[PDB]
Design a binder for this molecule. Structure first.
Ligand SMILES: O=c1ccn([C@@H]2O[C@H](COP(=O)(O)O)[C@@H](O)[C@H]2O)c(=O)[nH]1
Ligand SMILES: O=c1ccn([C@@H]2O[C@H](COP(=O)(O)O)[C@@H](O)[C@H]2O)c(=O)[nH]1
Ligand SMILES: [Cl-]
Ligand SMILES: [Cl-]
Ligand SMILES: [Cl-]
Ligand SMILES: [Cl-]
Lengths: 209, 209
């Protein structure tokens, strides 16, 4: 129920930390901080080295045509799933779903974000973004640990069978236990990778879980 | 280090047994007995239901053009890797490697088989099939548990970094421990799925390992 957000930017440190906490996870979320610094080949290296599932945290938010290209490159690189923003609309999300279907991969729909600014425009559209996901057949979602009442509403819309993961635990203020009342898994980055002992930090989260 | 060969033909029994032994594995080898009976959709169902890696045991052995089509359908269905026969030659293997590269997936090269008949024609070509794999850049191989001296020779050719899995353990007479002196993982089918208590059978193998 714990996903590591590996946002370190240098390959050596990323490999060190991921290896140290491998026993407490099986899924690593890799995003642009690491990929832009070390290249897309890092995805296949991680998948092979650690035998974990890899979720690409690219939160695609372009027009349909470009979203298709990004998804294809991401799955070609070996990612098991890609996170997609829902605010750009149904056609942009459908483009990602089409490529995931073609390549036997998964799409996670980001519905409401965890940072303070998410309240400005995203929050007001979040319920509709989640309903759009349900209408499109999306089965994997991302919602905020920092707002459990919003996480509850998201779970209500997507149902119990849908898979929901949630960032914002630790550094941003979210609580593991409270978040897991609604999400199937929690995403944790800094609380683990910036810790003096990442393995102990992960173990401590697991214990409370 | 244990891969389940799930060759039961009915979905209910396959799901039952795989769920019962899930804690002892993380990789399931699915082949034609199950796929032809329940459809290719069973691959994605297993991947989702159990969160395990899926190796498609199709041992592709056609001309390049057809091998390409089979590999594409297999990866579209969600398989993480596909097993390919090496006896048909380099072009047939290259066709599979090309699709695996396009889709961010893996190819396992079957070099020598485990049954008695493998001594008739395959064994005499096995060393060369393995060398061909090395020349083509193959990093994943399949060799026989029933002939550890042959498994040793295969390991010698492919090197220590290559990943080697081995069927023939249990029902066919192979030994877990002896096989693991050379292979990274053992494939076990009947000894587990036909057992009165599959979980206990898997646990017993794990203990001896
Ligand atoms: O609404 C969202 C969507 C994505 N992330 C991402 O999830 C991770 C959370 O990291 P951290 O705050 O645990 O360090 C980071 O990769 C971050 O970009 C959020 O934090 N909130
Ligand atoms: O040389 C080979 C190649 C493949 N398999 C396959 O590996 C599995 C071994 O099953 P079992 O003998 O443990 O039941 C089966 O799916 C079988 O088709 C072998 O046994 N030997
Ligand atoms: Cl993300
Ligand atoms: Cl972004
Ligand atoms: Cl096989
Ligand atoms: Cl066959």
């Amino acid at each position: 129920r714990l996903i590591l957000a590996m946002d370190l930017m240098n390959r050596d440190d990323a490999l060190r930390v991921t290896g140290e906490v491998r026993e407490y996870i099986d899924t690593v979320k890799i995003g642009y901080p690491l990929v832009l610094s070390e290249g897309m080949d890092i995805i296949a290296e991680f998948r092979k080295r650690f035998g974990c599932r890899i979720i690409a945290a690219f939160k695609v938010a372009d027009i349909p045509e470009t979203n298709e290209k990004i998804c294809r490159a991401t799955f070609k690189a070996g990612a098991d799933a890609i996170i997609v923003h829902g605010f750009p609309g149904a056609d942009s999300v459908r483009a990602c779903l089409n490529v995931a279907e073609e390549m036997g991969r998964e799409v996670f729909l980001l519905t409401e974000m965890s940072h303070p600014g998410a309240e400005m425009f995203i929050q007001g559209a979040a319920d509709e973004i989640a309903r759009m996901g349900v209408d499109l057949g999306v089965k994997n979602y991302v919602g905020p640990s920092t707002r459990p009442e919003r996480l509850s509403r998201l779970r209500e819309i997507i149902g119990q069978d849908s898979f929901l993961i949630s960032p914002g635990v630790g550094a941003q203020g979210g609580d593991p236990g409270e978040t897991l009342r609604f999400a199937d898994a929690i995403i944790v980055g800094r609380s683990i990778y910036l810790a003096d002992n990442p393995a102990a930090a992960a173990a401590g989260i697991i214990e409370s879980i």
